[PDB]
Design a protein around this ligand. Structure first.
Ligand SMILES: *[C@@H]1O[C@H](CO)[C@@H](O[C@@H]2O[C@H](CO)[C@@H](O[C@@H]3O[C@H](CO)[C@@H](O)[C@H](O)[C@@H]3O)[C@H](O)[C@H]2NC(C)=O)[C@H](O)[C@H]1NC(C)=O
Ligand SMILES: *[C@@H]1O[C@H](CO)[C@@H](O[C@@H]2O[C@H](CO)[C@@H](O)[C@H](O)[C@H]2NC(C)=O)[C@H](O)[C@H]1NC(C)=O
Ligand SMILES: *[C@@H]1O[C@H](CO)[C@@H](O[C@@H]2O[C@H](CO)[C@@H](O)[C@H](O)[C@H]2NC(C)=O)[C@H](O)[C@H]1NC(C)=O
Ligand SMILES: *[C@@H]1O[C@H](CO)[C@@H](O[C@@H]2O[C@H](CO)[C@@H](O)[C@H](O)[C@H]2NC(C)=O)[C@H](O)[C@H]1NC(C)=O
Ligand SMILES: *[C@@H]1O[C@H](CO)[C@@H](O[C@@H]2O[C@H](CO)[C@@H](O)[C@H](O)[C@H]2NC(C)=O)[C@H](O)[C@H]1NC(C)=O
Ligand SMILES: *[C@@H]1O[C@H](CO)[C@@H](O)[C@H](O)[C@H]1NC(C)=O
Ligand SMILES: *[C@@H]1O[C@H](CO)[C@@H](O)[C@H](O)[C@H]1NC(C)=O
Ligand SMILES: CP(=O)(O)CCCN
Lengths: 675, 690
């Protein structure tokens, strides 16, 4: 039989040692293809393998060695991505065919630059339909990346940032380094990101995790995304090129998320080589020497096993290959046309390398807990299948987030300060009405000798409606303050406008008469008093129906609650006010205060006698002086104090209660005196 | 004369876009060999230069490289390479045959890692020779708050990574660090929100029009900012990249006034000065000879940095060739089958040291990189002008003065001004309250005149002279307290401020004591009525005042209740320009404000409550005209209420310094006038009756 030759590069060390599991596997394939008499009746295949570490220097040297040695070769079988790209770019001047098996760069899909390139490894954009899904379950919108500046990761990051634009999520911070990552990690710590996705090699993984330990960028509020085809114990080896220790990585890599792609048919079929899948697994694990858990590149063996069978079937399809030069075209195009139209079934399911890539479907997701690997859940891309298993263990049983801020309205002491005021009002509100009743039924000669009780019923009704005004004053957003809050403040204002004006007028008209008499009564003064109070009623109703007080929120307080949660509280307080208040309230209080000063002037201008009507003038003068001074002292304070947590309510309530008490006692002392 | 040949790779044809550059440097080397050929430093040998073609393509370049290796004589070094990919592909795989590569136009920063480029030298300052010069310029203008805006390519990330290591150690901090891919001015909006004023940019030529127009909408121009941009763009690059078949989203005349006076940083092609260089002629001689040397090929800007590199190569080979051995050394330099590692080492180690004055100044290396010269340019009247220079061995920066200018009349500032301000009392209020208190003092003087006038009159009831005199003396002494309260830091200059607050407390306590004594004289009568000494009641009120005053004076002798000051940084623009002002206010406190003040306030409250109990009990003891037990009662109830109000008010209004002074002043003045009038004026009306 004649003999043909193939060229192969097997990486056995460096950033991705795969050849240690890949060199025997190809060596398990030739002995099976050279034993079946169907596919090759008069030819043998031989292999020329060389180590490269996928470094471009040794790769260039051995490529020069292969292209200018004896005998003449037919195909090349590259390794890692930097050499696959170099051979695919350089092979256009010799008319060869490049068939890779471990490269997953998306930029190798551009057929304009790479005409004679084929691969069995799937594209690396298959992680992007997955990650967005894990971004919608936990609800995030701000992420950050860090990468090693090779185009294999730049194009994948470009595709992810292109396809994340439709789900609303947006990148915020980008970093880069070529060989020394200390300054990007320092800047990332100083910028304080929380969700980080890493794209770098294994040795740089160690040289960044000991420096993320040296910058304390881990713990409870940091999430790390990594790649999945690393070794199982890629941190438990001794490396003299670092200064970090093993427990400073054992505490550093706890709680990161890894994603990988499945690569083996889980079913039970019959392949093209009459062999199931776990028997293949058993034979491969027997041929090796170390354990399959730490042997590098163990997952990618059936791809190379089908990568040989596909070319074997192709070489049966062509079937004059002994005078093949490096400058004749008719064979390269003949084999190309035979390879473009090939599809069959092998070990990794159906093998159809003729597409735009993307012939696998599923992925696989894992997390690290306690120094052990755990499988979270599978995924399918087409039918949106998501076989969850509910085993993810966060800190505190819940994943972190970025940072938020809550909005909080203020309240006050809804029990201690309010129920006491309520019972204190209820103690007097009933005494008021029973003294009014005593004024009612006492049709008595001597009471007729005293003043006419209509002006005392006016004062009593005024003080009763004023007393019954703490309940609209104490209520807030705790119970009712949702929609009819403007009506609660309206109730306040109506009660306030009535209950003060009525009693003050009912005293003021008596003091008016007792002034003007001294130095007709049954109808003159009552009607002009009624007119004056109806005037006062009109004033409130004018700018209560044209420019009312609905609601107003005021926010002052700052950030930083400084509790155990990073959340930030923003306190506010709502109260009833119009667009303009400091004019109307001022003018009404001054116009009323002038009337109060006029009343005290009229009380001062004669205190001496009383005759034939009533003689209550000393008591009513003292009571009205007391009420006047108390109101004049209390009222301009609550306009000044805006912190109405415990001052402005308490002052007004004390004023109201003291005024009501004094009014009651002054009004219904002489009845007990005369009886 | 056996020859020795060196390889060269450069584009040659005219069908490419970057061929003339090669066709720009071919005459220059064509001079230098003849200059050697006129002196023949290699006397027993002969120099040979082989030229090939790459067209900056990997397949053709690698094929030509392999063919030159396979079908060529023994080569020694490789010189050339202009396309930024095939150069890196060669240099990363140069160690297998032990050769050294010399480039003159590759200014990409990735060739600075000598961990995978051991055999690569260049004679041109790369983009990392810009970072020192700029820092020193900052030390000429004191700019410290700076912001960077970079793209995301390799060379624009290497420069941003190098800036931290260069700018480490000095007192300059990088405020922001942004990076965009297609939309720049979302981070331009972040820089606007962060309020930066000096911008250092790293982006290519295409993104500049978009950045300056959307950066023009946000108003980051005028006489308030300064941009530092790389300057290797071709001339007049903006009159045509802005057209770009329409590029309507920003117009021309609203951009030429936006990109005004940015600073461009580049290197310098030739030397301005004149000494005798290594050839034996002036730079002017070589420039005239080059300018009349070429026939029709257009000029380039890199023929000088390679014309000296060839002479560098000749001198290194001459300094490496003549070691101690001769016969074996000529056998060793003609047996080169690309395997002699020692020959490679003696070449690298002899090329490593070199020091002479070439045509671009001194040619000295540092870790492979040449120490060179940096040129600064500024943009005026749609044209670029040279403004400076930066040496590297002398580490000086020369500015061509009488040329540079700025849009305002001074260099801009890094940040706005922080101004601290005190909150003062309104002077009309202080004048009015002082005049009212002075009028009350004069009224008190009149009252004392009346008290002294009829001091010996039988109609004066001949009862309680000393107690009324003591009451009115306490009131006169208390009015000086509200005279003394309203001080200010501008009128004390921190000379007596540490004493006035605690003598305010002195005078205040004296007033309290005299108040309580005139309070207690009534209750003494009521205690007598509810059932030996000439001055013992006066003695006992003095004893009470003395014991509680030494309690205070010693407590405060121990207590250095002194001045403090807090601030509230919420600085808005009041004047409207830019000075941010914050308020700060002073105090006079102590580390035990609760114990001592709480004790004295509680004891004054207890005295007030005892007076309230006495006023509640007594309403009518049938006192003759010698006593006035009702006015005193009215006074004590109006005093107790006024005091417990003014107390709760002064403890509450802390954030409003212009209402608590007017409050304490009104409560004191009003209380004292009402008390004095209620005490005095019934006797005044009696004297008016006479
Ligand atoms: C690998 O290929 C061999 C064939 O070369 C497979 O063995 C075959 O197994 C089938 C059953 O799956 C046998 O069928 C049986 O045939 C016998 C008579 O030969 C009959 O008595 C039974 O009732 C049944 O029909 C078949 O004979 C046998 N082939 C030979 C040559 O004996 C083997 O299953 C293949 N392995 C895998 C993993 O697919
Ligand atoms: C990084 O590693 C170097 C070793 O090259 C450290 O230097 C050693 O420091 C220890 C003290 O921790 C000494 O006992 C050794 O004798 C040192 N050896 C040498 C060769 O210097 C260096 O301290 C480490 N630095 C950091 C920051 O980890
Ligand atoms: C690929 O291999 C198969 C099996 O060896 C070839 O199949 C042909 O099978 C028929 C079955 O009756 C035989 O008569 C033919 O003689 C077989 N061909 C040959 C060349 O022997 C098939 O032809 C091969 N494909 C090619 C040669 O393109
Ligand atoms: C090489 O194979 C590709 C496969 O993608 C061919 O592209 C066509 O792809 C479409 C996809 O729907 C198919 O419908 C066509 O049948 C494919 N054409 C052929 C001839 O198979 C491409 O044409 C092939 N041939 C080349 C590039 O010469
Ligand atoms: C190449 O030359 C440089 C400069 O001569 C050497 O750098 C060292 O520089 C310091 C600074 O003056 C000197 O004190 C040292 O003596 C120099 N080291 C020497 C001359 O060995 C550099 O080390 C040289 N590199 C090699 C490989 O010889
Ligand atoms: C856009 O096209 C119109 C049509 O000719 C032209 O008038 C206009 O100048 C163009 N805009 C710019 C900025 O050149
Ligand atoms: C430099 O500028 C100053 C202006 O302050 C000028 O007085 C001086 O002459 C200049 N020196 C030059 C142009 O050499
Ligand atoms: C970057 P690469 O796809 O060539 C290595 C893939 C390892 N599973």
């Amino acid at each position: 039989r004649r003999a043909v030759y193939i060229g192969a590069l097997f990486p056995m060390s460096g950033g991705w040692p795969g050849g240690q599991a890949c060199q025997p596997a190809v060596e398990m394939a030739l002995e099976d293809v050279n034993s079946r008499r169907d596919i090759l009746p008069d030819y043998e295949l031989k292999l020329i393998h060389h180590d490269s570490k996928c470094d471009p220097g040794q790769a260039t040297k051995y490529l020069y060695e292969l292209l200018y040695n004896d005998p003449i070769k037919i195909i090349l079988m590259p390794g890692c991505s930097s050499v696959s790209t170099l051979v695919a770019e350089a092979a256009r001047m010799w008319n060869l065919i490049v068939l890779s098996y471990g490269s997953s760069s998306p930029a190798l899909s551009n057929r304009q630059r790479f005409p004679t390139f084929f691969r069995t490894h799937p594209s690396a954009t298959l992680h992007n339909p997955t990650r967005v899904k894990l971004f919608e379950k936990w609800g995030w919108k701000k992420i950050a990346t860090i990468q090693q500046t090779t185009e294999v990761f730049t194009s994948t990051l470009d595709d992810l940032e292109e396809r994340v634009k439709e789900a609303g999520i947006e990148i915020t911070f980008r970093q880069s380094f070529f060989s020394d990552p200390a300054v990007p990690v320092k800047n990332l710590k100083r910028q304080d990101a929380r969700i980080i996705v890493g794209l770098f090699y294994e040795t740089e993984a160690r040289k960044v995790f000991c420096e993320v330990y040296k910058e304390r960028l881990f713990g409870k509020k940091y999430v790390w995304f990594l790649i999945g085809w690393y070794a199982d114990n890629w941190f438990k080896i001794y490396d003299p090129s670092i200064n970090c220790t093993v427990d400073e990585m054992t505490e550093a890599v706890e709680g990161h998320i890894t994603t990988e792609i499945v690569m083996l048919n889980p079913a039970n079929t019959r392949s093209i080589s009459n062999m199931t899948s776990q028997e293949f697994v058993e034979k491969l694990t027997k041929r090796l020497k170390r354990h399959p858990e730490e042997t590098g590149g163990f997952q990618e063996a059936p791809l190379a096993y089908d990568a040989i069978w596909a070319l074997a079937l192709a070489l049966n399809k062509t079937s004059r290959l002994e005078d093949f030069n490096y400058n004749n075209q008719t064979i390269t195009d003949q084999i190309y046309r035979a390879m473009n139209s090939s599809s069959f079934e092998g070990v990794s399911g159906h093998v159809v390398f003729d597409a735009s890539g993307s012939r696998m479907a599923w992925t696989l997701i894992e997390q690290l807990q306690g120094g052990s690997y755990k499988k979270i859940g599978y995924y399918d891309s087409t039918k949106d299948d998501l076989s969850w298993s509910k085993t993810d263990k966060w800190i505190g049983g819940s994943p972190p987030a970025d940072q938020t801020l809550v909005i909080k309205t203020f309240r006050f002491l809804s029990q201690k300060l309010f129920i006491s005021v309520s019972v204190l009002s209820s103690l007097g509100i009933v005494l008021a009405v029973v003294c009014l009743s005593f004024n009612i039924y006492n049709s008595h000669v001597r009471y007729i000798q005293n003043s006419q009780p209509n002006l005392n019923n006016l004062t009593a009704v005024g003080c009763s409606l004023a007393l019954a005004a703490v309940f609209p004053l104490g209520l807030d957003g705790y119970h009712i303050g949702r929609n009819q809050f403007p009506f609660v403040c309206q109730a306040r204002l109506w009660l306030l406008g009535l209950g003060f004006s009525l009693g003050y007028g009912s005293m003021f008209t008596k003091i008016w008469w007792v002034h003007t008499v001294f130095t007709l009564e049954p109808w003159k003064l009552y009607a002009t008093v009624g007119l004056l109070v109806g005037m006062d009623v009109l004033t409130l109703a004018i700018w209560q129906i044209v420019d009312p007080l609905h609601r107003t929120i005021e926010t002052f307080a700052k950030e930083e609650p400084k509790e155990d949660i990073d959340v930030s509280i923003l306190p506010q307080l709502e109260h009833c006010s119009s667009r303009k208040m400091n004019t109307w309230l001022g003018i009404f209080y001054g116009y009323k205060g002038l009337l109060l000063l006029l009343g005290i002037f009229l009380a001062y201008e004669t205190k001496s006698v009383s005759t034939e009507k009533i003689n209550d003038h000393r008591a009513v003068g003292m009571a009205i002086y007391n009420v006047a001074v108390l109101c004049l002292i209390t009222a301009p304070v609550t306009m000044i104090l805006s912190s109405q947590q415990d001052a402005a309510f308490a002052f007004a309530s004390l004023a109201i209660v003291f005024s009501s008490y004094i009014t009651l006692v002054v009004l219904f002392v002489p009845k007990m005196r005369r009886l | 004369s056996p020859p020795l040949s060196i390889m060269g790779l450069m584009p040659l044809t005219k069908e490419v876009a970057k061929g003339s550059i090669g066709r720009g440097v071919l005459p220059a080397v064509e001079l230098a060999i003849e200059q050697i050929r006129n002196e023949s430093l290699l006397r027993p040998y002969f120099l040979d230069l082989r030229l090939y073609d790459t067209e900056c393509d990997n397949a053709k370049g690698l094929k030509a490289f392999y063919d030159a290796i396979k079908y060529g004589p023994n080569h020694l070094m490789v010189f050339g390479g202009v396309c930024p990919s095939v150069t890196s592909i060669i240099a990363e795989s140069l160690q297998g045959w032990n050769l050294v590569q010399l480039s003159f136009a590759a200014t990409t920063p990735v060739l600075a890692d000598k961990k995978k480029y051991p055999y690569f030298f260049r004679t041109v300052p790369s983009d990392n020779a810009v970072n020192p010069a700029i820092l020193k310029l900052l030390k000429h203008y004191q700019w410290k708050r700076v912001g960077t805006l970079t793209q995301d390519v390799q060379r624009f990330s290497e420069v941003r990574n190098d800036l931290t290591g260069v700018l480490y150690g000095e007192d300059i901090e990088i405020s922001d660090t942004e990076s965009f891919s297609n939309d720049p001015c979302t981070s331009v909006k972040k820089l606007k929100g962060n309020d930066v004023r000096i911008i250092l940019g790293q982006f290519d030529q295409n993104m500049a029009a978009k950045v300056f127009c959307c950066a023009y909408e946000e108003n980051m121009y005028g006489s308030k900012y300064q941009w530092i941009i790389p300057g290797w763009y071709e001339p007049s690059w903006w009159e045509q990249v802005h057209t770009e078949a329409n590029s309507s989203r920003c117009l021309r005349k609203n951009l030429l006034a936006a990109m005004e006076g940015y600073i461009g940083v580049d290197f310098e092609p030739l030397s301005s000065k004149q000494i005798k260089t290594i050839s034996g002629k002036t730079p002017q001689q070589y420039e005239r000879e080059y300018n009349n040397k070429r026939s029709g090929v257009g000029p380039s800007k890199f023929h000088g940095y390679a014309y000296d590199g060839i002479w560098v190569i000749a001198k290194t080979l001459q300094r490496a060739m003549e070691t101690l051995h001769a016969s074996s050394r000529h056998q060793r330099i003609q047996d080169f089958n690309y395997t002699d590692h020692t020959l490679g080492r003696i070449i690298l180690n002899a090329m490593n040291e070199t020091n002479f004055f070439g045509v671009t100044g001194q040619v000295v290396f540092r870790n492979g990189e040449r120490m060179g010269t940096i040129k600064f340019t500024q943009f005026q009247d749609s044209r670029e002008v040279k403004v400076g220079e930066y040496n590297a061995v002398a580490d000086t920066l020369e500015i061509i003065n009488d040329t540079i200018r700025f849009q305002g009349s001074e260099p801009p500032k890094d940040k706005t001004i922080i101004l601290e301000q005190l909150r003062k009392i309104s002077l009309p209020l202080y004048s009015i309250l002082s005049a009212l208190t002075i009028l009350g003092m004069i009224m008190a003087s009149a009252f004392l005149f009346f008290n002294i006038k009829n001091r010996n009159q039988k109609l004066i009831k001949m009862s309680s002279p000393y107690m009324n005199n003591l009451i009115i003396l306490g009131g006169m002494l208390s009015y000086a307290s509200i005279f003394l309260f309203g001080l200010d830091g501008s009128f004390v200059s921190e000379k007596t401020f540490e004493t006035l607050c605690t003598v305010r407390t002195w005078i205040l306590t004296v007033g309290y004591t005299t108040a309580f004594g005139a309070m207690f004289a009534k209750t003494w009568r009521v205690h007598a009525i509810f059932k030996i000494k000439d001055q013992k009641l006066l003695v006992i009120v003095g004893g009470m005042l003395l014991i509680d005053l030494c309690i205070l004076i010693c407590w405060q002798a121990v207590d250095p209740l002194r001045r403090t000051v807090e601030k509230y940084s919420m600085e808005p623009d009041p004047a409207g320009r830019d000075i941010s002002i914050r308020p700060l206010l002073e105090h006079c406190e102590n580390t035990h404000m609760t114990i001592w003040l709480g004790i004295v306030y509680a004891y004054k409250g207890l005295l007030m409550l005892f007076g309230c109990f006495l006023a509640w009990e007594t309403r009518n003891v049938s006192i003759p005209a010698l006593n006035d037990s009702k006015y005193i009662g009215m006074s004590v109830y109006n005093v107790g209420i006024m005091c417990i109000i003014g107390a709760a008010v002064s403890f509450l209004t802390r954030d409003q310094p212009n209402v608590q002074f007017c409050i304490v002043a009104l409560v004191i003045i009003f209380c004292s006038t009402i008390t004095l009038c209620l005490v005095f004026v019934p006797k005044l009306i009696t004297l008016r009756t006479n």
